[PDB]
Amino acid sequence: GKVIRTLRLQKEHWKRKHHKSKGIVGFPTLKNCEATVEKIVHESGRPAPLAIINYKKEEKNTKGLLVAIEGIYEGQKIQIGENASLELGNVCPIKEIPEGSLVSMVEKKPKDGGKYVKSPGCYATIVYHNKLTNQTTIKLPSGERVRVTGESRALLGIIAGGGKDDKPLLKAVNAYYKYKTKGKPWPRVRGVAMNPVDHPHGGGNHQHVGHPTTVSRNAPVNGRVGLVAARRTGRKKGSRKITVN
RNA sequence: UAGGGGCGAAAGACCAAUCGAACAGUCUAGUUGCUGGUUCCCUCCGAAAUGUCUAUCAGGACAGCGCGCACGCAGAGAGAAGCAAGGUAGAGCAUGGGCCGGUAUCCUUAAGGAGACGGACGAACUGCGAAUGUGCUUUUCUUCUAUGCAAGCGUAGUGGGCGAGUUCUGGUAAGCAGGACUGGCGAAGAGGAAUGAACCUGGCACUGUGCUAAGGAACCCAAUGUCUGGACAGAGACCGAAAGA
RNA sequence: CAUCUGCUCUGAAAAUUGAUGGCGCUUACCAGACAUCCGAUGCACAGUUAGCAGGUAGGAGGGCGUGUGUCUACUGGCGAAGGUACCGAGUGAUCGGUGGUGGAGGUAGAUGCAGAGCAGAUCUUGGUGGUAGUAGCGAUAAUUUGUCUUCAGCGGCAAAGACUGAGGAGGAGAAGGGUUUCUUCUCAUAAGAAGAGUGAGCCGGGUCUAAGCGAGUGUGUAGAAGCAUGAGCGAAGGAGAAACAGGUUGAUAUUCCUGUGCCUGUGCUGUCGUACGGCAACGUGUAUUAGCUUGUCGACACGAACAUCUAGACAAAGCAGAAACACCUUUUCUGUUCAAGGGGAAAAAGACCACUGAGACGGAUCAUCUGGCGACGUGGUUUUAUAUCUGUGACCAGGCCUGAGCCUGGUUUGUUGAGGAUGGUCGUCCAUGAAAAGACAACUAUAUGGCAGCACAGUCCGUACCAACCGUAUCAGGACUCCAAGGUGAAGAGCCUCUAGUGGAUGUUUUACACAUGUAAGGGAAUUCGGCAAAAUGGAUGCGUAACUUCGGGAGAAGUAUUGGUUCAAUUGUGAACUCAUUGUGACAAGGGGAAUCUGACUGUUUAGUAAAAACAUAGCUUCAUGAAGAGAGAUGAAGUGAGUUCUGCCCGGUGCUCGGUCGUGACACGGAGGAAAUGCCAGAAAGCACGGGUUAACGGCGGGAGUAACUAUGACUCUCUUAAGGUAGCCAAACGCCUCGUCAUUUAAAUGGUGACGCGCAUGAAUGGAAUGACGAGAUUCCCACUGUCCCUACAUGUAGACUAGCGAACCCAUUUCCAGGGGAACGGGCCUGGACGGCCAGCGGGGAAAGAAGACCCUGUUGAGCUUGACUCUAGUGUGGCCAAGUUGUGACGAUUGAGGCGAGCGCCAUGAUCAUCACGACACACUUGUUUAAGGACAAAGGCCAGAUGGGGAGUUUGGCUGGGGCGGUACGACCACAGAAUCAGAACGUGGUCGACCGAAGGUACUCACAGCGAGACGAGAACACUCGUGUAGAGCAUAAGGACUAAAGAGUGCCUGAGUGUGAGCACUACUGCUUGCAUGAGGGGAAACCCGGGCCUAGCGAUCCUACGCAUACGAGACACUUGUGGCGUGGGUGUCAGAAAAGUUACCACAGGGAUAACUGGCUUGUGGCCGCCGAGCGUAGAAAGCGACGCGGCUUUUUGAUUCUUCGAUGUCGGCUCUUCCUAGCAUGGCCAUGCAGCCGUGGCGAAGUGUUGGAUUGUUCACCCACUAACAGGGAACGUGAGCUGGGUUUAGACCGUCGUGAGACAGGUUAGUUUUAUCCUACUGUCCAAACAGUUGAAGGGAGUGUGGAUUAGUACGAAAGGAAACCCACACGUGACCUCUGGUGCAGCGGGUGUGCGGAAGUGCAACUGCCAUGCUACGU
RNA sequence: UAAGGAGCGAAGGAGGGCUAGAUUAUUGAGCAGCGAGAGGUGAAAUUUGAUGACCUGCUUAGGAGUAACAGAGGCGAAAG
């Protein structure tokens, strides 16, 4: 047969375009700074708003981008790095923040610029500090617990734009605007409605799959469709998670 | 974004009147056990549609039947006369299978059974047995025979057949399917059955005079009349049963 | 009288008209005989001749002709070759001469070399016919008259008549074209030839940057591709310094000329400058370069309402000129202009500054709103149009003259108003709506800078025209944009007009059949698969509006009434009166409505060119995988179901996916033992596999049999088999039910239909999603109201073609000689044989030419393909897993490998610890390697490369998927062997002919020598019986012989008993159609067997139990071995084993309804032919039955025929094509007689019937369900018989069924896919030829006639009278003449319907100044003549 | 007014809403010790344990609750 939809959309001419982008998002590199928030802006592909910051490096003014936490305003002064106060919207070394606190834009290793929590409405929880090894345990929004060194930086607050998934998209055109900038195929034609030249689920005198939909992790790429390496299937209840800090 | 690739609100849709794999050009005069065609005259000879093996059944090869060149040469698609083998037609029912009825007598019953016998029968019953056909010897056995036979060598076509008379098997039968024997049409014209591949007479270089065949002889149409019996039905010359006055 | 033989007779019925061959024959027949004649390519005689003589496929011998070579002989201007008429020679292929034409070359003989002879190939190229002066040439607005040319153009010009109608058939640009544009001449004409024509600082290109492309360099590659970075490039419609009026040419113009300007720079001469004002909001002053830095401009979505301006359009008055006047009118028409640049208001809308000090309150918008972070008020500051003036006069209208110049006007007011411009507000979004070049301000330094005059400069390329573009063209198609008047009306709708633009194949009143349209008595879907098509409804205003519902909707529900003109009131609500001959959204424009069911939620999308859908999409719902990112779990990808409401039961046995451990297996490397060494051997061994768990909103799956309740039925209850679990809740003859047209109710006169119920449901059912509704479908289906030419049943009229005529002018197709009936024939003839008939012409028509299209698409065959699937065969990319490979450095412990000095148990193995090399975790440093944490972080790990080895692998690649066969498939095996039967008494001998057997078994069931029988039957012998052991007599096999069938065997070949391993070893010859195989037989040998010996034995009493080349295993002796020699491996020879059952021997699964190619009537799906089982119809006999009684009527059990209208059986004709079911329409034939006419019998009183005979003239209907033929009901009737003609009839129609490609359901399949199972959507081409048929002319002067031959026509019902009669116990109950009607036939318009071309009238919208006369769009009342039936 | 409503003074109650804290207990994980059974009942089986249960230490993570004092005691319109 021919090449499936899933492979074609991974070729280079289909990658997302950057022509409307504001810049690369991430923290400054300097040990200490005082910054001012210049503007709060929407960026074409992203639902969380961005804040433009201004800080001096040598004598010269320089500009950066952060993801906005909820409760900043244009004109606010913010303090970055060691010796910053625990005030909403400051950036601090993680070892300085008390247990049970909520944080965003956490660095996985020092000076990486911030990864981890970046989507609207999300946060992470500080669950443990180890005074020997200088590690800290953070609980991520998937439920995963990960350990990071005390020298990493983090932003104090919750990411702006929460609640967005409460309102249903009642019409086809509303879905159109949401997926127009994403990589997923919309509208999505079902594999059982294709001919066998186009998809492993195609063909036959009734619409059916005909073979089990759970497939191996090591299966060849042009036929790896369906539920890939599923441990279980169906709507029944699972089992207890195992937890360590 | 480009061909075993694209693109698809999915129809195998669309990608320059081309898409269940584009166009241009080359390899390439790709291959073909299958269809079509294959160019002058006269003379002489003249088939086969069967057997064995084949991923064989619309094809091959080997053998059998033609022709050419021919070393050589007592032979013959016919009879007699001695001699073998055969189990069909007819005939029979003696081992085996198998239908109906029995006198005297016998056994029991007071029923039935057996029976000295008669009638009816078999592709896989036989005690007897033809005609026709087959083989052996003898030219020291009639009759024919050189314009004849012919080892050997080289090489062709053929390997869908069909029909008549006599017979057979399967089938209600069939211008049906399948065998055997002797001549045909295939590859055969001419005269006759009004017409007809195969039926009757009878086998063809080219002319002329006579005669016959088969079939005809009022007229169409070359040749026709006679004698004796039957027969009356718009009958017969061409044409159907059991049953009948 | 009874039998038998001959001829006649009865049994004896088929579809166009018919066949002893015809006409005829009764003395042309049947049977028995007789005469002699006619008749072959045969026979006789005679010529010619080698004479011996037919011939396909095929084979051989001798000759004729063509282009060129070598030689010999000749020839041509006193006319060569060629070509054309005649004449001679040869059996023939061919050859020779004569007369005209032609104008320079040509042969005869013998040999040599070949591109060496045509009727055909749907042959190749070129040229020409018939058809044929024919088919056609005419969609759109429309044309007439005069006059000149033209020389014969509806060409030009005047006057009329029309049309596009400002979302134009008008005026311009772009893409595309490229001289098509202008002048002259000529026809050569959508034709040529010769010239001429496009002028810029201010218009556009050359500039900037979007999405993006990229030279070079780095890395890579055999070279490439690719990847990282990046000079340069990327918009004639995005950003982008500065121009406008009026004139002029045959053709250019914001480009030329005149006038008035502007931008960017340069230079001269004058003339001034180095600062101030306001509480402030800010002003006055035309101001230099340069630089940091901060900001602004360039610089931006959609939608709605409200202001203001400008084009435009109206109406009054003034003047100037036009139109109209039988009448009337100060009625009607055209005009009334002002650019860029300069100067400049009031106004409206917002910002802001000073004073002031406000509320349970003031201000303010069409709408939101607004104020102590300062309201109202009073005075100011600033930003954004426009009117008006100047632009020095141009331009327009009119008058007077004129081959030129003068003169006069261009004045005032009101209403409205964009489809253009601008301003400040408001709404929407999980969508927030480009960059850069180039500018400007503030701040800091620095200063000869501003203005006026005059002068200079600004390169290069494009510039004509389009109705001329792409479709083979002068093609009804396609193709990016701009400007836009008046009336009617909501409206750049339709209809009518102004500005501007427009047109030719000719004449004829022109039948039939058409194509676009009108109208119709009475009836109203009766029509048809189906209301398909048409009709009906229609705008605005008011009254009045149901079920159900997600509460939004349904809803314009439905149902009803009103509407013109005039003259008034009243001011947006509307009222009232008067008036008209059909009435008023008058033309144009403009919904039919209701009740239910199946199905998809909705708007949206799709097979360009047969499918618009129930299919796809969609919002919502659920599952899966991941902490990797230029992205970071409210994320990023993969699947399934299909909005909302309400539910979503049970199963982890199989298959898959996933998790955990090894107990076993499982590669290469790395080790070990041995040997002179190679080859082998042993260990070792990840992941996988196996094993144990999880998982169905994963693939999917979800039962049988018996009994049992006070009538019968049914079974809550019991028992029994069975499993992974035995279909829960719901729903149903449903788009899913075979039987099936299921049963009951309702709808109709009548229901294969619809709806409601019921349910052991062939084969319903739960995100392979189940069930109940709303709103919305060009979706499928049933019914009702309105409405109608769909129909009964057709008639009349209009336009355009068509017929005839002038001008112009083709194609398909074609072996052609073409009237029928029967016969035969390749089984349906135009042509052949025997009969019936025989002409040409013009216009129509569709019976035939199995008419033309196109090497049948269905079906089979080919050792021909391609797309797609998987549990087919053999490989492969990707993904995982192991060991090894760039000398990192140094610590600690550990297991392991190798050998000593210790200890235990009757020097052994076992237990202690001490030295020698690798080596697995763990630490701590920095040097390889990694990362924009980069003057940095990690770190010998990772990540990325390389060489070998295992695992997985329809993601892909190649290929295969036997044969015979009463077509193929499914089934069997007639595919290798053996016996019997038949195949007309040797042997042989076919069919999916008949009855069967084989793929082995046995140390004896083999070899030998000797002994004796057997199966039964008749007597005996205790228990002991039907049947126990023992005896005597008979006993030709009635028994046995392992295993089919046949043959064979008696002191044995059978049953016993003894001994043996001949079921030896070498090597020959033969038989069965004879290779393999099986058997028969010769000679030589054994320290061979059995027997006294003669004799016998190298398997089974005989006929069946089996297999090549190459490779490999074993036995046997004799060989070979590379320069030489020794050994371990190897190679030769003979013979046996390991195996091919498709058995004279390849290594192999499906599907195509998406399909291709070569062929086949060697072979299926129609018709025809042969047959007639089965279907239908008729005879013979007489057992019984009929109230008696064979036979009025019947007729068992048996027996003989006919028919082709049923279905089989067979495969002769057609696969380079004979259009396939039913209906509609129309004609003819048959009889086996339903009605109607004449008769005979009766169990015939009469009435009504029943059985038969001669007879085919005239009849045999309207409907409901269904695609039906068929069936079954209702209504009528004299009666509602049965059939044929290529299952009559598609260049006659229709297209409901079946049978291409889309899609749903059930059952089957792992799947692609299947299903004489159900459902819905699905392109019907061409006559102009010949012949037939229908009419028309000629053959046939004119007037009057004749009648050969051909055609043919009237059929039936009722009433009255006989008559309440005959006849019958009664009840009942018949038989001419006359009159009324229906159907059919032929005519006719006096009457009555219908139609409206000629004729008279009326109104609506808009044109010609009014009235009168009238155009266009079309509407409407009456109606001559004519034609017609619903009339006579 | 030994009818009602407004108000003053000192005091009492598990009456109600909110904010910030608490002693144990029951489960779950981590690590350490030990080396065979634990659980449950009238009596037992499903079941769990050498991948170390049970029991004893130390760490942690959550979400409920307020024992004994506590009564013919108190409060509220009742539910509480």
PDB file of C-alpha atoms (C1' of nucleotides) in Angstrom, chain B residues 148-202:
ATOM      1  C1'   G B 148       6.545 -55.765 -60.239  1.00  0.00           C
ATOM      2  C1'   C B 149       8.643 -56.064 -55.329  1.00  0.00           C
ATOM      3  C1'   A B 150      12.592 -53.781 -52.517  1.00  0.00           C
ATOM      4  C1'   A B 151      16.805 -54.051 -47.295  1.00  0.00           C
ATOM      5  C1'   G B 152      19.345 -49.503 -46.099  1.00  0.00           C
ATOM      6  C1'   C B 153      19.986 -44.157 -45.728  1.00  0.00           C
ATOM      7  C1'   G B 154      17.829 -38.972 -45.490  1.00  0.00           C
ATOM      8  C1'   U B 155      13.490 -36.138 -44.561  1.00  0.00           C
ATOM      9  C1'   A B 156       7.885 -34.289 -44.782  1.00  0.00           C
ATOM     10  C1'   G B 157       2.819 -33.874 -43.241  1.00  0.00           C
ATOM     11  C1'   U B 158      -0.532 -36.103 -39.455  1.00  0.00           C
ATOM     12  C1'   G B 159      -1.676 -37.238 -33.943  1.00  0.00           C
ATOM     13  C1'   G B 160     -10.131 -32.181 -33.141  1.00  0.00           C
ATOM     14  C1'   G B 161     -12.475 -36.655 -37.491  1.00  0.00           C
ATOM     15  C1'   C B 162     -17.357 -37.698 -39.406  1.00  0.00           C
ATOM     16  C1'   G B 163     -20.948 -41.041 -41.892  1.00  0.00           C
ATOM     17  C1'   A B 164     -23.399 -46.028 -44.213  1.00  0.00           C
ATOM     18  C1'   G B 165     -24.355 -51.350 -43.569  1.00  0.00           C
ATOM     19  C1'   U B 166     -23.996 -55.253 -39.751  1.00  0.00           C
ATOM     20  C1'   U B 167     -23.639 -55.585 -34.345  1.00  0.00           C
ATOM     21  C1'   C B 168     -22.760 -54.012 -28.903  1.00  0.00           C
ATOM     22  C1'   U B 169     -22.742 -50.805 -23.862  1.00  0.00           C
ATOM     23  C1'   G B 170     -24.941 -46.483 -20.794  1.00  0.00           C
ATOM     24  C1'   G B 171     -29.743 -43.753 -21.168  1.00  0.00           C
ATOM     25  C1'   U B 172     -37.481 -42.917 -21.539  1.00  0.00           C
ATOM     26  C1'   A B 173     -35.162 -41.345 -25.750  1.00  0.00           C
ATOM     27  C1'   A B 174     -32.079 -37.999 -29.159  1.00  0.00           C
ATOM     28  C1'   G B 175     -29.468 -35.199 -35.932  1.00  0.00           C
ATOM     29  C1'   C B 176     -27.181 -38.053 -27.767  1.00  0.00           C
ATOM     30  C1'   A B 177     -22.449 -40.089 -25.444  1.00  0.00           C
ATOM     31  C1'   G B 178     -18.854 -44.257 -26.173  1.00  0.00           C
ATOM     32  C1'   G B 179     -16.314 -49.337 -28.754  1.00  0.00           C
ATOM     33  C1'   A B 180     -15.670 -53.549 -32.909  1.00  0.00           C
ATOM     34  C1'   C B 181     -15.719 -55.203 -38.416  1.00  0.00           C
ATOM     35  C1'   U B 182     -15.902 -54.154 -44.143  1.00  0.00           C
ATOM     36  C1'   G B 183     -16.281 -50.224 -47.882  1.00  0.00           C
ATOM     37  C1'   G B 184     -16.845 -44.406 -48.243  1.00  0.00           C
ATOM     38  C1'   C B 185     -16.757 -38.425 -47.724  1.00  0.00           C
ATOM     39  C1'   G B 186     -12.388 -35.932 -45.874  1.00  0.00           C
ATOM     40  C1'   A B 187      -8.844 -35.452 -50.565  1.00  0.00           C
ATOM     41  C1'   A B 188     -14.055 -37.502 -55.666  1.00  0.00           C
ATOM     42  C1'   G B 189     -15.926 -35.181 -60.667  1.00  0.00           C
ATOM     43  C1'   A B 190     -19.834 -37.293 -64.009  1.00  0.00           C
ATOM     44  C1'   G B 191     -25.394 -39.580 -65.001  1.00  0.00           C
ATOM     45  C1'   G B 192     -29.780 -40.873 -61.612  1.00  0.00           C
ATOM     46  C1'   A B 193     -33.077 -40.546 -56.661  1.00  0.00           C
ATOM     47  C1'   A B 194     -37.390 -32.703 -58.150  1.00  0.00           C
ATOM     48  C1'   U B 195     -33.592 -30.484 -54.257  1.00  0.00           C
ATOM     49  C1'   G B 196     -29.291 -32.979 -50.468  1.00  0.00           C
ATOM     50  C1'   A B 197     -20.918 -34.209 -48.205  1.00  0.00           C
ATOM     51  C1'   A B 198     -21.750 -39.733 -47.227  1.00  0.00           C
ATOM     52  C1'   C B 199     -27.678 -43.446 -50.983  1.00  0.00           C
ATOM     53  C1'   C B 200     -28.046 -46.179 -56.685  1.00  0.00           C
ATOM     54  C1'   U B 201     -24.890 -46.667 -61.436  1.00  0.00           C
ATOM     55  C1'   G B 202     -19.896 -46.002 -61.637  1.00  0.00           C
TER      56        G B 202
END
